[PDB]
Amino acid sequence: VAKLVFFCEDVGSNKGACIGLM
Amino acid sequence: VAKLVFFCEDVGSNKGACIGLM
Amino acid sequence: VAKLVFFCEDVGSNKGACIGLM
Amino acid sequence: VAKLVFFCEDVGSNKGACIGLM
Amino acid sequence: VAKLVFFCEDVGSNKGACIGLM
Amino acid sequence: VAKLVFFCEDVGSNKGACIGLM
Amino acid sequence: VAKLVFFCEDVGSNKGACIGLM
Amino acid sequence: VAKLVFFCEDVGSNKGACIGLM
Numbered sequence A, B, C, D, E, F, G, H: 001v002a003k004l005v006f007f008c009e010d011v012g013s014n015k016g017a018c019i020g021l022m
Helices: none
Strands: A005-008 A018-021 B005-012 B015-021 C005-010 C015-021 D005-009 D018-021 E005-010 E016-021 F005-012 F015-021 G005-008 G018-021 H005-009 H018-021
Touching (some): A018 C015, B005 C015, B005 D018, F015 G005
Parallel strands (some): A005 B005, B015 C015, C005 D005, E016 F015
Antiparallel strands (some): A005 A018, B005 B015, C005 C015, G005 G018, H005 H018
């Protein structure tokens, strides 16, 4: 985003994970 | 969250809109 | 824009990074 | 996001549409 | 304002705080 | 942070650029 | 900003202080 | 702020005047 920033989910407990994107 | 972390939700078409949290 | 609105740009991998602006 | 908040694109060469999100 | 433009307000002590407007 | 909070960086000329984040 | 929102930065060599602004 | 972004004063001496900052 430059630094690396996590993008995390919270979709009905489908996921609570994240991914690094610049 | 400290550091910036993006939290995403469904918007349709398997796309995510993500806001930042500290 | 007043009121807060999120303005997003694609960071890849189906995710959009959005910040609040007025 | 609660309250209805608008999300818009300024990605680049694809002008800005928006949608409301909670 | 489209484009990002910062609007600033003096908080004294040689500094002003500025928010984004579209 | 929830609630919007402005996070500000110095950008010179005794001005802080401030972004909303949760 | 109306309504009271906190504005924060990172003071000194490192500690985060905020103030209320409208 | 990258690109040049205008920082405009809201009240006081130089209201309506802006400077470019990064």
